[PDB]
């Protein structure tokens, strides 16, 4: 009975009980999510608090096997997930206070209200109303009062709590032997492994900054192109060498530039490829959509959907008075039970989402052979990355001709591909400097490199320097603008959206070269390439049983993040964008301000 002997045996009692308890929690969640009643939300809470109590006991029991006596890395990685306990290391006072701060920020956010100055009796919450203005309005002054009011009325309430939140989180992280709350979050990319696959939490900062500097060229050119196009819409308020005003970017924050498409579309007379009418003419139903998704995964040699997937999924809004959650989710209920919940409509969007969500299911089905504790993505960016590349193939006209939603003589307009790559860039490329800079500010705040006397000051310096976006009204330290975004107010890490996006195109480029794909990357359909499916299964079956560096190399053949596959995806757009901007300034000076 060595320490490893006992810990192995401890983990055998854990898996059989954890599997049972997690399975009941997952089943009760499903009864609630597919039928919102107070009866079912009762069973859910009772079932989830049985699990948490079991987990907390097993967590402190697993600290009885000291990690440094565990040679077998598989046993170690499992024990590692159990010795993370979180905020339970605080005193009763300091942890009760933190939870109450967290609930206050969250509800300040969801009840946040701003009213129209031109009509004080016209008041709006964020998610129905203020977003509607922020995603649709072309009125500089209407966007402005919604943007500024959101941070004055809501963001100013979050400021004293966020200061306290930082302090208690930094204590919680130090009591768990991390440097600060940021270094704590970066531990999700930590990796113990064989020689050459280790990854430190400080490596992530370096790998994020390196990759981003390779993105700066493409983003600058996209930035300058969008800027020159907004001048036509807002001639009074755009400077052709300065930053873009923060309230004109297509949502409450500029997180995505998606909704700038109407204004910045290169060739407006060419419509998007939308096969919705084709699906409706062919009398497709939700059942047919998922059968086509299944067919796609079979075509690359991947498993069928189980007999139970069809019997138990919720693939359409019930509409019989039963109240459901319509957000699309892929459910890994345990014990070979896999389901998808979404309110599918006969649309090319929901067709695409089905392929994406079924990719989540395939991943789950591949790592179900692994121990309970290592059934998850290699790191937090893998799962959605795997999901996103399914939409990439399923949307290509190559694939849309194969399944018959486009005629066999479909002309591929070069003007449509640039329309398409630009729409993709506004979302995928626009968010990347936003995502890195938001997380860089939080990282520096947690390390203490930004004293709270200069929070808001350094937030807009980095916004102007990195993102090329400028505040339209000056903001002193009464503001807490980062907390005006859901993820900051609600205590979620944000860097996953950066790393996922990188991983996304590394995956796609590797399976496309395995499929012997010919042309530009963005035209790749891995369908009917079992060669490519096996390359992907090699990574999927691993779960988080191996360091994410090895899991990554098992599919793309390198141990680290690489943004070059992303840049060749947008390569036809890059060269097209350089040529549009040739007559104008490219970049931005960070000295101009709309308020000046």
């Amino acid at each position: 009975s060595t320490t490893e002997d006992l810990a192995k045996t401890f983990l055998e009692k854990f898996n059989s009980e954890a599997e049972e308890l997690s399975h009941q929690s997952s089943l009760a969640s499903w009864s609630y999510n597919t039928n919102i009643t107070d009866e079912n939300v009762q069973k859910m809470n009772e079932a989830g608090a049985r699990w948490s109590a079991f987990y907390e006991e097993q967590c402190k029991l697993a600290k009885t096997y000291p990690l440094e006596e565990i040679q077998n890395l598989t046993v170690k990685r499992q024990l590692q997930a159990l010795q993370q306990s979180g905020s339970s290391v605080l005193s009763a006072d300091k942890s009760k206070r933190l939870n109450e701060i967290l609930n206050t920020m969250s509800t300040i956010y969801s009840t946040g209200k701003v009213c129209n100055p031109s009509n004080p009796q016209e008041c709006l919450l964020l998610e129905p109303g203020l977003d509607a203005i922020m995603e649709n309005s072309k009125d500089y002054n209407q966007r402005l009062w919604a943007w500024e009011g959101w941070r004055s009325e809501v963001g100013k309430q979050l400021r004293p709590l966020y200061e306290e939140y930082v302090v208690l989180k930094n204590e919680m992280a130090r009591a768990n032997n991390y440097e600060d709350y940021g270094d704590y979050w970066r531990g999700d990319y930590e990796a113990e492994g064989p020689s050459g696959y280790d990854y430190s939490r400080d490596q992530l900062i370096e790998d994020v900054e390196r990759t981003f500097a390779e993105i700066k060229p493409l983003y600058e050119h996209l930035h300058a192109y969008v800027r020159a196009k907004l001048m036509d819409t807002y001639p009074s308020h755009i400077n052709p060498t300065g930053c873009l005003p923060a309230h004109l970017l297509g949502d409450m924050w500029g997180r995505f530039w998606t909704n700038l498409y109407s204004l910045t579309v290169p060739f407006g007379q060419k419509p998007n490829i939308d096969v919705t009418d084709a699906m409706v003419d062919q009398s497709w139903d939700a059942k047919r959509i998922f059968e086509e998704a299944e067919k796609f995964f079979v075509s690359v040699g991947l498993p069928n959907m189980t007999q139970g997937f069809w019997e138990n999924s919720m693939l359409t809004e019930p509409g019989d008075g039963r109240k459901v959650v319509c957000h699309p989710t892929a459910w890994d209920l345990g014990k070979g039970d896999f389901r998808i919940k979404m309110c599918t409509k006969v649309t090319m969007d929901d067709f695409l989402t089905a392929h994406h969500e079924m990719g989540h299911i395939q991943y789950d089905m591949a790592y179900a052979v692994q121990p309970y504790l290592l059934r998850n993505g290699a790191n937090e960016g893998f799962h959605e990355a795997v999901g996103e590349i399914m939409s990439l193939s399923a949307a290509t006209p190559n694939h849309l001709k194969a399944i018959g939603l486009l005629p066999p003589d479909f002309y591929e307009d070069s003007e449509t591909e640039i329309n398409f790559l630009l729409k993709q860039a506004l979302t995928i490329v626009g968010t990347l400097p936003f995502t890195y800079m938001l997380e860089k500010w939080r990282w520096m705040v947690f390390k203490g490199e930004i004293p709270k006397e200069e929070w808001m000051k350094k937030w807009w310096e980095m916004k102007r320097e990195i993102v090329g976006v400028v505040e339209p009204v000056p903001h002193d330290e009464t503001y807490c603008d980062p907390a005006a975004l859901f993820h900051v107010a609600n205590d979620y890490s944000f860097i996953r959206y950066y790393t996922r996006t990188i991983y996304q195109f590394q995956f796609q480029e590797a399976l496309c070269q395995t499929a012997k794909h010919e042309g530009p990357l963005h035209k790749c359909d891995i369908s009917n390439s079992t060669e490519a499916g096996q390359k992907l299964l090699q990574m999927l079956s691993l779960g988080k049983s191996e360091p994410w560096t090895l899991a990554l190399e098992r599919i793309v053949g390198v141990k680290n993040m690489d943004v070059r596959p992303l840049l060749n995806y947008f390569e036809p757009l890059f060269t097209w964008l350089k040529d549009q901007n040739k007559n104008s300034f490219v970049g931005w000076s960070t000295n101009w301000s709309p308020y000046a």
């Binding site: 045996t9 401890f10 009692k13 139970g308």
Partner: protein, 196 residues
């Protein structure tokens, strides 16, 4: 008279694998064709004998051992197998002479809230000898520290529940197993196939 195979196969409830039932068959005439030529069985594997030759044979006893396990574990009811069932619940010998029969029993052994009536042994100091049966509930002492009938850090209760739900995957669904074994001793052979 005819052999009571209906009582074992069509029994309403089956034993837990750790306490697998054993029914002795004797002094009767068995038509094995009602079994092999049937289409109700996902597994029908014989080892010491040929199944179609079983109607011409005479044995002194026939044993029918029955229990319930998950589909992914039926694999272990075979000679030279290992794993949690074969090691600690039901062990078949290398020299096994008989047949292993199995069907999916989801319809009768999974129930809505979960069926927890079927148990299994998870820990044991040593592997079972063939056809051995252990039904003790002594605290498994994993470490050097004695347990004194008290569960704790390295002191584990040895029996655990299967949980069968109608919506589990095929691999985790309940399966009923009947293991028929045969033996021909120095004594009257009373269990025979149907005579012409």
């Amino acid at each position: 008279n005819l052999c009571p195979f209906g009582e074992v196969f069509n029994a309403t409830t089956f034993a837990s694998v750790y306490a697998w039932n054993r029914k002795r068959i004797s002094n009767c005439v068995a038509d094995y064709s009602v079994l092999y030529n049937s289409t109700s069985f996902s597994t029908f594997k014989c080892y010491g004998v040929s199944p179609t030759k079983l109607n011409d044979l005479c044995f002194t006893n026939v044993y029918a051992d029955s229990f319930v396990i998950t589909g992914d574990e039926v694999r272990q009811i075979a000679p030279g197998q290992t794993g949690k069932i074969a090691d600690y619940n039901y062990k078949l010998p290398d020299d096994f002479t008989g047949c292993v029969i199995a069907w999916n029993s989801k319809h009768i052994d999974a129930k809505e809230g979960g069926n927890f009536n079927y148990l299994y042994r998870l820990f044991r100091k040593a592997n079972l000898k063939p056809f051995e049966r252990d039904i003790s509930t002594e605290i498994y002492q994993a470490g050097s520290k004695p347990c004194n009938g008290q569960t704790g850090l390295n002191c584990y209760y040895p029996l655990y529940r299967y949980g069968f739900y109608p919506t589990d995957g095929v691999g985790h669904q309940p399966y009923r197993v009947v293991v028929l074994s045969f033996e021909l001793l120095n004594a009257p052979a009373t269990v025979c196939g149907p005579k012409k």
